Each structure stands twice: as C-alpha cells, then as structure tokens.
Amino acid sequence: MNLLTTKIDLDAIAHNTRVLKQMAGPAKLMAVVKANAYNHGVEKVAPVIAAHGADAFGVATLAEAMQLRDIGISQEVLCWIWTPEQDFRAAIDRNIDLAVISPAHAKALIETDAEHIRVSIKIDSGLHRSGVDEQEWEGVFSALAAAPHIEVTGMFTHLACAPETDRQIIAFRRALALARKHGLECPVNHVCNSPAFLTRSDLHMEMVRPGLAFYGLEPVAGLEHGLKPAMTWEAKVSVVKQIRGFVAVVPAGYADGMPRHAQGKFSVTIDGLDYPQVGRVCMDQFVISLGDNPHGVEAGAKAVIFGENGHDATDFAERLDTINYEVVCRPTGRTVRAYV
Amino acid sequence: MNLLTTKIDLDAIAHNTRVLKQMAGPAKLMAVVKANAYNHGVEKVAPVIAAHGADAFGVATLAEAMQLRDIGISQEVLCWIWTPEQDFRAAIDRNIDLAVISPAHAKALIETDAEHIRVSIKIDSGLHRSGVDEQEWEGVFSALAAAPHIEVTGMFTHLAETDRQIIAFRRALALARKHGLECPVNHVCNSPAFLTRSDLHMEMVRPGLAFYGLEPVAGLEHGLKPAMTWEAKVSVVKQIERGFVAVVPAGYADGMPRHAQGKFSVTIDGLDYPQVGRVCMDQFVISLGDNPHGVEAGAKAVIFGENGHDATDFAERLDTINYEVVCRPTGRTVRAYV
Numbered sequence A: 001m002n003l004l005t006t007k008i009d010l011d012a013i014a015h016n017t018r019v020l021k022q023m024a025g026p027a028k029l030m031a032v033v034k035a036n037a038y039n040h041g042v043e044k045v046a047p048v049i050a051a052h053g054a055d056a057f058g059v060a061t062l063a064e065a066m067q068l069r070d071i072g073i074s075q076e077v078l079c080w081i082w083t084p085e086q087d088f089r090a091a092i093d094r095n096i097d098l099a100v101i102s103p104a105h106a107k108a109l110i111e112t113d114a115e116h117i118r119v120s121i122k123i124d125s126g127l128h129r130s131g132v133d134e135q136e137w138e139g140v141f142s143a144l145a146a147a148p149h150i151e152v153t154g155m156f157t158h159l160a161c162a163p164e165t166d167r168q169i170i171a172f173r174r175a176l177a178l179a180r181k182h183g184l185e186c187p188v189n190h191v192c193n194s195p196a197f198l199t200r201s202d203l204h205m206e207m208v209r210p211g212l213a214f215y216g217l218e219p220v221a222g223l224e225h226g227l228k229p230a231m232t233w234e235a236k237v238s239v240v241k242q243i244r245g246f247v248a249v250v251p252a253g254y255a256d257g258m259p260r261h262a263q264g265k266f267s268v269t270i271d272g273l274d275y276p277q278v279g280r281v282c283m284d285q286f287v288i289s290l291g292d293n294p295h296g297v298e299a300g301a302k303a304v305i306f307g308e309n310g311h312d313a314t315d316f317a318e319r320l321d322t323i324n325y326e327v328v329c330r331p332t333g334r335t336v337r338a339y340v
Numbered sequence B: 001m002n003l004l005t006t007k008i009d010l011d012a013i014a015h016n017t018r019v020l021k022q023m024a025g026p027a028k029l030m031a032v033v034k035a036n037a038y039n040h041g042v043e044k045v046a047p048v049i050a051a052h053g054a055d056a057f058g059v060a061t062l063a064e065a066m067q068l069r070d071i072g073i074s075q076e077v078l079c080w081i082w083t084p085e086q087d088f089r090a091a092i093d094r095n096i097d098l099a100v101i102s103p104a105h106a107k108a109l110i111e112t113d114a115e116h117i118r119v120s121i122k123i124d125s126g127l128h129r130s131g132v133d134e135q136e137w138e139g140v141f142s143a144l145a146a147a148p149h150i151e152v153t154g155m156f157t158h159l160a161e162t163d164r165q166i167i168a169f170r171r172a173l174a175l176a177r178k179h180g181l182e183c184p185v186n187h188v189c190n191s192p193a194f195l196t197r198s199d200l201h202m203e204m205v206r207p208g209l210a211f212y213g214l215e216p217v218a219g220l221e222h223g224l225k226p227a228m229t230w231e232a233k234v235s236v237v238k239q240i241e242r243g244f245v246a247v248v249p250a251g252y253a254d255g256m257p258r259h260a261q262g263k264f265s266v267t268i269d270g271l272d273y274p275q276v277g278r279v280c281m282d283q284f285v286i287s288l289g290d291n292p293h294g295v296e297a298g299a300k301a302v303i304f305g306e307n308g309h310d311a312t313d314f315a316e317r318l319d320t321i322n323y324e325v326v327c328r329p330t331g332r333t334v335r336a337y338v
C-alpha cells in the first residue's frame, strides 16, 4: 500500500480521445504525449490513445519518440527537440519523423546516408524561438528539395499560446507557398495545439496536434467540450495531531512536487470536504488544519490534493497562480502512479 | 548524448562523508538519503557513503528503506514515515528500524507477531507535526516497555525554539527512562544543528544536506564540496533583432518552474545570460544581447553547479532553498555520475 499516488483514469483518456477524434473530422489526429504523457504515464496512455483513433503522436525528444516505438506504437511519430550532435540516425532507423528546426538540422539530415528520411519543417512564424525563420526558408527548402532520400511530409508551427495567432498563420502560409514553389508538396501540415483546436476549426489544416485535451483539461476558461480529467493526486494522512484544535499530516513534500510556495494557498479534500494547508511545506510532508475535526478525520484517511472527489487541476492551478499544464506535471518523488 | 543532465560527483560525496565523519567524533553518523538521496541517486550514493564511514542511514518511507537493503546496504537503517496499513512487517524482516510516530503505530508494533523489533520513538517536541506528544509520553513509554519483543533503541525529534524543543525532548527522555526504557542512542541533529551545536550531537547525528556538499547556514564554510550540477546544451540560437536569443532544452516538466521567469540566468563559458519570456513545458529562452562571445547551439549552459551559480545562489534567485533546487531536476533530465 502506497501513501502517495496519482490515479490515472485510462477510460477518461479513451473518452477524451474519442471526443477529440470526432472534433477533428477529416483532419488527422496527432496526440502530443511528450513529458511522459504529461506525467500520466506514456507507457499506458499512448496505447489507449492509439486504440481510439490517434493518427499519429508528437513528442519533444529523440528518447521519447524511441520510447513510443518501444511500447509498440506503430503510428506516425514526430519529434521536434534534438540536435545534430545526438544519435538522430537511431531515430530515423526507427521510423521516427524529425522536425527541421534550423539550417544545421537540415544539413545534418541531407548529409545522412539513409534510404528514406521523413522530416517535417518546423517554421519560426514570429515567436523567434526554435524553427527555421523567414530569412532561412529559401535556402532550407531548396536544400531539402534537392535531397533524394529526404521526404518532406509537411511543415508546422507552434502557435505560441496567444491577434498574434493570425499574424503567425499569415507568415506560415507564406512559408508553405514558398516551399511548394520549390517543389516541396508539404502534404500534411499542422499548427493547432489544444487551445487553437478547441476554438479555430478554420485552422485544422490536414492535421491537429492537441496534448492537454487528451488528459481532460480545458485550455481556455469558460469553454465546455465534454472532457474527462484523468489525473487525481492523493495521499493518505499519516498522523492526526491534536493541539481544541487538530492538524493532520499528509505524506507529500516539495521532494514530491508540492511547491513550498503553495503554502497557505490551497486545501486538500478528505471525503469531499476541504481542509486548508497550513505552515511550511517540508521535504517529505505538509500539514492541514482540521479545526475541531468535526468529521472525525483519522490517520489513513484519503486526502485529495487535486482530481476526483476534490478540486480539479485547473482550480488548484489558479490557487497556485499557475496553469493546469504545470500542476499535472508536478506529482513526482515518492508519488506512485496507479491506473484507474 | 543528452541535452539535459545532472552531473553527480561521487568523489565529492565521499569527501563530504569523511568531513562529516570527522566532525561527528564518537557520535554515530546516520546519513539521510531519503528522496532518492536528495535526487542524487541513492543506488550509487548510499554505497559511497557507507564505504566512507556512515554508521547508519535514515530515510522516510518503507519502500526507500527496502531499496537500501536491495542495493546491499548492511548498515543500520531507520524509516520514519509509514502507517500500520502498510506491510511494515516486511521491513522488520529485513532489519529496518521503525519510528513510533503516534500511539497507533506503537500499538501496531506491539501487536506484531515478531521476535525482535527495533524501534525509535519519534518525539513531538513542540512542532506538532508527526511524532508522539507530551500528553502521550506516558501511555506510549509504558506500553512499549511492557512489550519485550520490542527493543526501544532510543528516541529522536526534528528541529524547526531549538533549545525550547531540546528542553521538551529532555523531559520525554527522562520520563522514558523512568519507565524502564534505557534509550541508549538518541538523536536530534540534522545538518544545520550538527555543524553548529556540538553540544547536541548526543549518541548519533542525522545529517542529510551536508553529504551533498550544501551548507545549511548561509554564513560560513565547513569544507564541503557540492555534488550536483544541472546543465543543458543550447538547442538553437536565433536572431531576434542585432540581438540574439538561445533556446535551452528544459521546461517546467523538467523542473524549471514557470514562476522562475525573469528570476534567473544560466552560465555559458563562465558568463551569465538572462532567461527571458515565458517558460514552456519543454524549454525556456535566454537573452544573448549581440552575442559578443559567439554562443552557438550545442553550448553548455549551466543552470546551477560546477562552472555556474551554486545551488544556494540558484535557490535564492528562485525564492526557495537549496534543499528544493537539488530535488528539482527531473523529467527528461538524465542523471550522470562523475
């Protein structure tokens, strides 16, 4: 028996997958499962998402993409954070699509002697982060077009989460036209992350790549989509102490993902009732006040930090002055992952 | 090659152990290696510490305790965060000391059908968290003393006042002995109290932080050597103006909090470059100005540690403590030993 765990509801994930598949329509559905499926356990999550419609998967690193192939994912897989200094050839060998994020990346790929290399051009559409920018488009498209063994499956841009969006699309379309003018068909393109996907059907293109929504969380406040949250972070009270007040100790500290800054900003839920966190969050635990403990909370009681039978990830996120993306990624350390 | 890693200096840890072993004198040295040895990798760290003098090891959970036995640690082991509902019996069968942190824990142990159970009494000396409080002294000591299959090896408490907690701890110790509990080996010193209160060493000291080379009291040195370095390789350098920015392969899913925005910089070739903009899930951006030093993709960016700001400095910049920063590197971060 574990005192600290995250409950991962796989059925909720399948549901979310079905809801996203219906919403995508004719567009392909790429499931973004980087960061170990947003901390939900990609080894279990990805197969469920695959079994319910996902046309492809998107991850950040070479290692994550390779892990997907390891568990048996046979769908198209895209990786966008790697450098020519790494063994990217190992990914190519595993049928992993690689994003061209800079001229140097394009160069390393063209100079790679492999039969057929699938690549997707990451376009810097204005954020000035990663990706090939306007001044480099000409050279890169020309170089990739001249490479026999390279197949440019398309291009994509990451609508940084923002007006801003439409300005990015204009630049992206300028790049796509320039690419095709160079002989690059760019058959499958995508720009939609969860927020854009759930609000801009005009930007579906040939493929959409939402991440957050698969885990049942809403990207924009005020919007309903019938999603089912999949993660619940909960601990079992280790000790109930009487000071006629009482406090309870819950076996979770900053070493487990509970920020020290969360002090005095939230409550956990025991049997559906809230109890405010009090005092300093320590390395292995934090304390909550039971008041006169009228409901008779005892050691062993289940305390929901966020999730089922408690406050959802979004509420907890706002209490912590952050976003739900970060809260689901927080549970770590002694926290054990349990499915459904 | 990995774009994001923690470099763990095992020789530094051996060094820190020797230092702490010296300062401990006749007092037993129990190294705290809970939380995977403060995120330094207990499977490699604990053996080094044991090989250099540690008399015992302290961890929080049964699983962490069992993990020490699994790696072959033969020293005394104490575990202080568990409940009667867990299979603590399996831990007793592997010679793992259990802390009595409430009357119910004492009850469970007393009712456990085992021949010899080594226990340490966790004393609530005023903090009012876990541990047995003064109102419970009597009942617990008297019950444990009447159970011959249990060996009360001693008692301990945790410092937040300090002297105040000590006064209380002493009272409990006296009552326990009055009840027939000898309490041969007691302890209260964590890293800060150990380095400054030689009068509180007692029979055993319980340092954690110091073994990893970090100083608890920002004021003076003790000759420790920091053991961890968190660093990344620039993935791309982009022109934004004639200014440039560089993308660093680490986000809040890897341990870099979104709140860290505008609070820090990374060190590249000994010089600092400010993080700017929003911290995303997989990466953050730094400002290079006109990039006078020609930083290129592939460059080594030290977040904290060797060739960068030490953990304490980084912790202050992010409004936290060094204990938390060494626990932060996670996600795609790959641990490497040097």
Ligand SMILES: *Cc1c(COP(=O)(O)O)cnc(C)c1O
Pocket (backbone or CB within 6 Å): A032, A034, A058, A080, A158, A192, A193, A194, A195, A209, A210, A211, A212, A213, A219, B281, B282
């Ligand atoms: C994280 C990420 C996504 C997923 O975004 P959500 O907002 O979670 O839908 C999509 N594309 C890229 C390039 C990403 O890094």
Ligand SMILES: *Cc1c(COP(=O)(O)O)cnc(C)c1O
Pocket (backbone or CB within 6 Å): A283, A284, B032, B034, B058, B080, B158, B189, B190, B191, B192, B206, B207, B208, B209, B210, B216
């Ligand atoms: C974490 C812990 C320690 C170690 O403390 P440092 O401040 O790192 O030396 C000692 N005792 C207990 C009970 C602990 O939980």
